[PDB]
């Protein structure tokens, strides 16, 4: 192998029409590399178990949560490309120090699927990048753009192998960590989700608390009324893993509102919008049940929303159930 | 770190009461190491997609299936410790060549969770080791012992990190691959499963085809009749991953008989018995619904069985549903 | 470690006063990473022994020579930053294709110390970067600048660890490959060579062919006339290794003219100028015996010169011997 | 690659005629693996510079010296295979604790070429294994056997790649660390040194202090009296590196007695005997100048001797110079 298409090179060669974005990305990828390495020897570096605090969303934080958060913050700030960061792990927006100030806003989940670290299930890092457009002092309000205004977004999946899915507006590209070469190399370009899939994905243990629309849709997946095979169920419990399987296999992923979580559980800014962006870029759909997730005007950095995404025909059929029930 | 407890050293220091077993294991671990490395750069070494054949169980084989199978076969044979191997990927039993003949029989699944390779979910390698006891020529019949007669058994999980769970009769020990040192190092000794868990795990997309006992038990998990919280649902779709989460978090994993699979789908010899062995060693239970899996006399190397395993109280409650319905 | 000073970040944060240079470098580093990985498993990937040709300097080429050459060429060209490359391994200058044309000229030795690959001695990659200043069509003549006009230069040393020494005009910085993180991280900033050292380094097996000046200087190292200890001898036989030891320990490295090589043996463009640049940046000296190497106007891409470099006082004393003998 | 010849497997398959030796070796290799990994990120893990003490041979100890020493001691002791260790870094012999006592004696240099760590030259680990033959309490005296009585011996070279040379009495075999697989794999079997070489290797900076025999031999290498080409000079300054180059390229390596070191400088037990053993096994010679090194009865664990080894015809010619001068 003497001509490897690294991430950086592919972004440079397609983007031939902005560098500052590509420098922000290279910092993110460095963080992702560092995280991936820590994840991969987590038990040996005695890194499982609690950290000893709760975040502003009610999540019992792990030792990795803290570690991967500083990696991302330090790396992003050091790029000279950011002004405002939002993180699952910090209460307020982190304003970049003036001497390092750049034009971009990043919303990120430094480690997703935390309840699944101990059992070595796939886990990930999720990010959305915006451009600061307002003229005032950098504040949390700059991070409150509609996901419709994302400049680049994606996720890292620390699974059986380490993978980045990324989009800067021209489709989704999949990159993979080459351990030999310590870099991300392109493996799939311009991935498009199947129009219709064969897998449904949700925590079905909340059945007792679903609204009628959800209850009905699920019934159709398991008990179709047209002789077709019932859909297979899969639910990893790490949103990155479930969302990535959705992208490459097809199907639907659901984390909707329920009685216990009246407005959904997943965070709009740094979980829902980044994956919504990827799925839309891949020809799929991503909805709250009433509108596309990317069209929701966020009103608070840690705001939650319902999320239903995946193959267009599957989401369309889910939205029918919503209409048929309101 | 100047005093690392490697697998080999822990087995040597506890087993102070057989080397030939420990040499067989060291060969297995070499195979596992090789597999883990291949898995981890699978997309880059262009290793996804089909192989171009079906196995004797009806499974569309992947390129890895073939690769990891030869690794295991070559490694095991080379140990001078085996006489008979059974593999998911080979139609008949593989008799070791006379000049390399040893006393042990190994049943293995060289790569489990094959439908989940492309989406980078956790996948694994599963193995059970027996002692040849009969006096005749090494044949498939030597591989047909009850799992009750296992001498050592375990699995490798190629997840966010690479882990081996192993038992030689004195409890379960968890080892992890140290990438720096290229060896397995002990992380948890004598793991014991929770008496009762909070997670149920099955492909719920077969709901339409469950027998009444299964339908009823699941109803109790989602709609308890005693005010308690419903159990959470998790289903990775790779039996190693689901079984490992069961071991460390607690709960229940189910792949029972259904209309489409009248006698279950998982293979007795190289899937069910090895995990049944681990779970029993950890204080859990593993049943076909009518007897403990380890007590089933196998009659054919590729025989299937129903599998329900996990926290004792959870399995007990499942067996009630079976009694209450027969 | 949550705030790592990677190469890229250090160059970005010091250079705060040009990106296109930093993109050229990132491509070089990718090549260096790839080479380092190949070197490190060279025997296993059956990569020792001949390639089956001779280069335009009379060197029997190895399989690595060829491999590392394409890596460097493909990587550099792909940066969109080059117009002209010179390589030890190619007869003529390689003009970049118009659609990828940039402003920089690179002279490189893709793998140095080739006679030392088989015995696993340290080996390296050497490079000098110039800015195209002339207005005509990109040609070999653009690569014929005085090393005095270097914009950035350095070397990779694939030793017990992998290290890059780099200068862009503001001193020498040492970076090291972090295998965990797949990147170069700063280990020493602004290294300065000892004014006077205690080690002399040359192939002493050419004693019979040295000119009087060299013979005399060496006599003074082994038989001092002032009661001081004689200098220690060290000679690895890979110029990068010997030159790097010179930089960090102090002393002198000599590959001067001799009867067999009347004008020296080392190549001016892609061996001598890059190390001359590093040593001068570090407060040392690097001479042909009659002038500073960086002041030689090259007249041909594969031109050779005598090289004597290292601690200033040691080189000064060597130049005395030259004056005292002409 | 589906059938890799690992060290362990090659030793097992050739030794088909002792396991306890092979378990001792597997512990050594684990130590070597750990050391190799530490060496390779030595600058990043801030591991250069002094330790703050002197050993009983007069050597300013490094931080690695200490680290690699405990690795070797802990690993070897844990094998249940040793009774007595001798180390360059410990004043007295280390008697194994009774409950871990085995039959073997190991003499080792846990890290050789310490003055060359900072400049990233090749460095190594050197070892000789004996069988305890005496009946008394394990003491230092058990470590005082003639190298003629070695049961297995070799070295690790942490160079551009990591290599082990090993002999158990049936020739020399070369193994290499596969980073992918974390194990040593055979690369060359039964290596034999060239009858006569073209490279001479010694610290020539001691010229002023050589005895006449050495002065004369060196004169013949640089100023032959028969029209042949003078030999090339190479001197890395790490005995493992120089000795390994000698083995694979041919030639001679010299660290003889001189005025400053009247009885030589290299340590008999854990430097000279192990390499003497390798070279003799490879058809070469290794002498003190008056007898074969392996025939010297050691009288003290930290005893020094002159060492001249390499291609037989070259050593023979050196011994002539000794005879011609006594
Ligand atoms: Cl997973
Ligand atoms: Cl070296
Ligand atoms: Mg959390
Ligand atoms: Mg999170
Ligand atoms: Mg999250
Ligand atoms: Mg299969
Ligand atoms: Mg399988
Ligand atoms: Mg399977
Ligand atoms: Mg060459
Ligand atoms: Mg070269
Ligand atoms: Mg060269
Ligand atoms: Mg020392
Ligand atoms: Mg030493
Ligand atoms: Mg030594």
PDB file of C-alpha atoms in Angstrom, chain B residues 9 26 36-37 39 47 51 54 79 87 97 104 114 188 200 202 214 226 230 257 265 287 290 302:
ATOM      1  CA  UNK B   9       1.213 -17.133  34.736  1.00  0.00           C
ATOM      2  CA  UNK B  26      -1.564 -20.847  24.732  1.00  0.00           C
ATOM      3  CA  UNK B  36      -8.394  -9.790  17.143  1.00  0.00           C
ATOM      4  CA  UNK B  37      -5.806  -8.031  15.036  1.00  0.00           C
ATOM      5  CA  UNK B  39     -10.985  -7.886  13.095  1.00  0.00           C
ATOM      6  CA  UNK B  47     -12.340  -8.245   4.656  1.00  0.00           C
ATOM      7  CA  UNK B  51     -17.111 -15.652   1.037  1.00  0.00           C
ATOM      8  CA  UNK B  54     -23.105 -21.782   2.932  1.00  0.00           C
ATOM      9  CA  UNK B  79      -0.047 -27.650  19.960  1.00  0.00           C
ATOM     10  CA  UNK B  87     -15.951 -26.326  14.051  1.00  0.00           C
ATOM     11  CA  UNK B  97      -2.872 -36.255  12.001  1.00  0.00           C
ATOM     12  CA  UNK B 104      -7.923 -33.227  23.936  1.00  0.00           C
ATOM     13  CA  UNK B 114     -21.042 -12.780  11.661  1.00  0.00           C
ATOM     14  CA  UNK B 188     -11.297  -9.807  37.278  1.00  0.00           C
ATOM     15  CA  UNK B 200     -33.859  -9.183  29.394  1.00  0.00           C
ATOM     16  CA  UNK B 202     -33.843 -11.765  23.028  1.00  0.00           C
ATOM     17  CA  UNK B 214     -41.808 -17.336  26.273  1.00  0.00           C
ATOM     18  CA  UNK B 226     -46.152  -6.175  41.386  1.00  0.00           C
ATOM     19  CA  UNK B 230     -40.030  -3.159  34.023  1.00  0.00           C
ATOM     20  CA  UNK B 257     -37.252 -22.671  20.339  1.00  0.00           C
ATOM     21  CA  UNK B 265     -31.139 -22.019  16.557  1.00  0.00           C
ATOM     22  CA  UNK B 287     -31.254 -24.337  30.445  1.00  0.00           C
ATOM     23  CA  UNK B 290     -36.460 -28.689  30.185  1.00  0.00           C
ATOM     24  CA  UNK B 302     -24.028 -29.623  14.531  1.00  0.00           C
TER      25      UNK B 302
END
